[PDB]
């Protein structure tokens, strides 16, 4: 009845790494042979953001790339001004358990959301001079762990149970679900293009989806426990993941398989936060131990270290043009290195 | 001083928003948050009316001191993923019934689950307020079938004060932890008018001794 | 949003007198405010300015000392008192609203005005023109030159241009040099450098006919520029 289709599923999932191992012709490594190294990178902190009085918990930069917004675990979501330190805005929240925030790439939204189960839009450019909330999305059953805006009217949202969405803000219904996953699924990342995206969950897998047609495309394993993090490759044809093992990994679209990994044998600690560098030549991981690391893409070698805080790294962040770079962590306090 | 007439009020606006966020923290600071916990069909409700979507709150005041209790029982999800959350609390509240030791097992679920969150690696030391719910219950049980269902082994009388005496060893022996923190036991039935003064008693002590930790003098 | 404006009359020299603003429609605690004038005939006037939090006052050098200006944030109200009037203090009053932080764009929102009348190191901004005549559906351009270089070490230009109509209270068209501000259509545009600036319409129609005024915030007291009269 049933065994002659579990039967099938192992048929194709073994037909499946067959073809992927016919196109292994030649690791990443052996390519990127006679080619100069990077060498040592030193990097200073400029500024020293404070006012949190508790964790913080996520944070975005700004298209413009010089405002900020931060959350944290007592009830604000605060607006930075980077280079003059000044604070802009202030908006009290009516639920302290945050886990996420996102910023408009117009700059008119806020996006917010946590263990409530709800998605909170917030306008900042009105006409009496105060934020006030402007839309409360709901219909998922469990904590809430990533967004972010397409336009001034499309947002994706990723969920503690095993699905993700996509919402209507005029209507505040949801227009596709995307449900493949068993586990739960902690972060997304959208292309330049903003026609696909990718996500992770506790099962140790990461899934390619297609916007419109809302149907899974590929799948991506390899790694042995939860994946935390993820991050597209500024070409937008590979993409980077990042788990509780302590290492990093590269998978690559066209090829349908990994290129490399990162890891280093005195790293023995989780990783909460990845991110790319403008042109792809740098990946900056934050890491349990109150540290982040520098690796050079094209290598695993490790090019720098980035410690000056002193507890947990929750978040960090680059800028649409490279300059600086942001980090968060639950010492209360966010830092900017140049 | 180098800035127009138009940086200086974003300066004065900034100083304003610090204090604001001055009065908001210091504001948020006087009160006593709790975090309940246990397995249904417990008692929680019958705690929870006589004191006063995911996450539930709830508020009481007594001797003018405020507590704020969290339930979170409607989750459903990994818990490891945001138990880190609660870490800085005062204290827990775990509510056990007494009554439903004869009805795999759920007592032995019970303990299952105190032994899981007593031995977290995010509640070292943190203390936990124990209540044993349905004490009339369990009285009324214990005459007609014996305590030898849960525990093969028990080599005691059928009396209530003896088998309450043992399953409170047998509870409070769970914890690894000994020198870090302390379980503070209570029974109790659905008619009661003193729970919330033995919180009262149990917070003020575990309040004075971390003061008396926090400047050496320990 | 309205900001309405009381008092205001007759009085003999010497006297004294107080004037009433209250407002209603946004958030009035957070909010800067200032006080302008017009003579019967002339151009407009700063007079004086109160901070957010009452925490900062300014006054202009013609009413140091003499008046004073004082806010009320539960009651929603702003107040004016005025002492030993002179001959050369009618006029019509306006009060105006400004916020200050990264992108914001003060002197948004003006008032209707009261009259009151009375029985008997500073940058110049120029403008030499007035009474120019056009015809509906031309390519007009208005121009301002000033006696100091308004360009910041940050990068600012501060200047502003308002249009007052017949019978009307001035409305802002340009909040900084090359920003043009929200409702008004992309006929106008505004651009310059250094002492000069330009300010330039596409097409007009029948509506947009009135007097411009060009003006400094660089720093205090906040002088204006002189009218530029359009006739049909």
């Known amino acids: 009845e049933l065994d002659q289709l579990r039967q099938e599923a192992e048929q194709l999932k073994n037909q499946i790494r067959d073809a992927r191992k016919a196109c292994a012709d030649a690791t990443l490594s052996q390519i990127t042979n006679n080619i100069d190294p990077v060498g040592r990178i030193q990097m200073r902190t400029r500024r020293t953001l404070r006012g949190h009085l508790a964790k913080i918990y996520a944070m975005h930069w700004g298209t413009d790339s010089r405002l900020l917004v931060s959350a944290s675990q007592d009830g604000k979501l605060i607006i930075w001004d980077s280079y003059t330190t000044n604070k802009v805005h202030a908006i009290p929240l009516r639920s302290s358990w945050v886990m996420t925030c996102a910023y408009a790439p117009s700059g008119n939204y806020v996006a917010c959301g946590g263990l409530d189960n709800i998605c909170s839009i917030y306008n900042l450019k009105t006409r009496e001079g105060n934020v006030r909330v402007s839309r409360e999305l709901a219909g998922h059953t469990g904590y809430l762990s990533c967004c972010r805006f397409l336009d001034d009217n499309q947002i994706v949202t990723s969920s503690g149970d095993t699905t993700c969405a996509l919402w209507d803000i005029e209507t505040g219904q949801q227009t596709t679900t995307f449900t493949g996953h068993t586990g739960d699924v902690m972060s997304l990342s959208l292309a330049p293009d903003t026609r696909l995206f990718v996500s992770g969950a506790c099962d140790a897998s990461a899934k390619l989806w297609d916007v419109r047609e809302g149907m899974c495309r590929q799948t991506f394993t390899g790694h042995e426990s939860d994946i935390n993090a993820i991050c597209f490759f500024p070409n937008g044809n590979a993409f980077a993941t990042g788990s509780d093992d302590a290492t990093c990994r590269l998978f690559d679209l066209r090829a349908d398989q990994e290129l490399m990994t990162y890891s280093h044998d005195n790293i023995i600690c989780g990783i909460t936060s990845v991110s790319f560098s403008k042109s792809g030549r740098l990946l900056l991981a934050g890491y349990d131990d109150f540290n982040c690391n520098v690796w050079d893409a094209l290598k695993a070698d490790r090019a720098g270290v980035l410690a000056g805080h002193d507890n947990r790294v929750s978040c960090l962040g680059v800028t649409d043009d490279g300059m600086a770079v942001a980090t968060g962590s639950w010492d209360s306090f966010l830092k900017i290195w140049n | 001083c180098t800035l127009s007439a138009e940086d200086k009020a974003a300066v004065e606006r900034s100083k304003m928003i610090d204090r604001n966020l001055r009065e908001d923290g210091e504001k948020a600071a006087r009160e006593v948050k709790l975090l309940l916990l246990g397995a249904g069909e417990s008692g929680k409700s019958t705690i929870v009316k006589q004191m006063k979507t995911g996450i539930v709150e709830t508020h009481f005041t007594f001797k003018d001191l405020h507590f704020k209790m969290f339930d979170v029982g409607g989750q459903r999800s990994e818990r490891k993923k945001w138990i880190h959350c609660f870490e800085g609390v005062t204290a827990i509240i775990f509510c056990v019934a007494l009554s439903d030791y004869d009805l795999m097992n759920r007592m032995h679920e019970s303990m299952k689950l105190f032994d899981s969150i007593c031995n977290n690696k995010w509640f070292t030391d943190t203390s936990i307020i124990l209540f044993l719910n349905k004490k009339d219950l369990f009285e009324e049980k214990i005459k007609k079938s014996p305590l030898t269902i849960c525990y093969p082994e028990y080599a005691g009388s059928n009396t209530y004060e003896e088998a309450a005496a043992y399953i409170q060893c047998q509870f409070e022996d769970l914890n690894k932890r000994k020198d870090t923190k302390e379980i503070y036991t209570h029974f109790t039935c659905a008619t009661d008018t003193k729970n919330v003064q033995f919180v009262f008693d149990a917070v003020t002590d575990v309040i004075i001794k971390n003061n008396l930790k926090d400047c050496g003098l320990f | 949003v309205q900001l309405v404006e009381s008092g205001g009359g007759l009085v003999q020299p010497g006297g004294s007198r107080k004037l009433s603003c209250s407002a209603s429609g946004f958030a009035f605690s957070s909010f800067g405010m200032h006080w302008v004038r017009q003579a019967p005939e002339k151009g407009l006037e700063w007079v004086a300015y109160?901070?957010?939090?009452?925490?900062?006052?300014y006054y202009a050098d013609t009413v140091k000392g003499r008046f004073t200006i004082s806010r009320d944030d539960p009651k929603n109200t702003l107040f004016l008192q005025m002492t030993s009037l002179r001959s050369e203090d009618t006029a019509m009053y306006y009060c105006?609203?400004?916020?200050?932080?990264?992108?914001?764009?003060?002197?948004?929102?003006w008032g209707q005005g009261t009259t009151l009348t009375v029985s008997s190191s500073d940058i110049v901004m120029t403008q030499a023109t007035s009474s120019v005549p056009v015809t509906p559906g031309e390519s007009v351009s208005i121009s301002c030159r000033s006696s100091?270089?308004?360009?910041?070490?940050?990068?600012?230009?501060?200047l502003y241009w308002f249009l007052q109509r017949p019978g009307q209270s001035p409305q802002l068209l340009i909040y900084r040099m090359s920003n043009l501000a929200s409702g008004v259509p992309d006929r106008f545009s505004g651009s310059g450098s250094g002492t000069a600036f330009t300010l330039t319409i596409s097409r007009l129609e029948a509506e947009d006919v009135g007097v411009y005024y060009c003006?400094?915030?660089?720093?205090?007291?906040?002088?204006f520029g002189a009218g530029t009269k359009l006739e049909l």
């Open positions: 100091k270089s308004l360009l910041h070490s940050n990068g600012n230009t501060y």
């Open positions: 109160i901070s957010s939090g009452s925490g900062t006052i």
């Open positions: 105006v609203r400004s916020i200050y932080y990264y992108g914001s764009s003060p002197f948004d929102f």
């Open positions: 003006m400094q915030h660089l720093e205090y007291p906040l002088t």
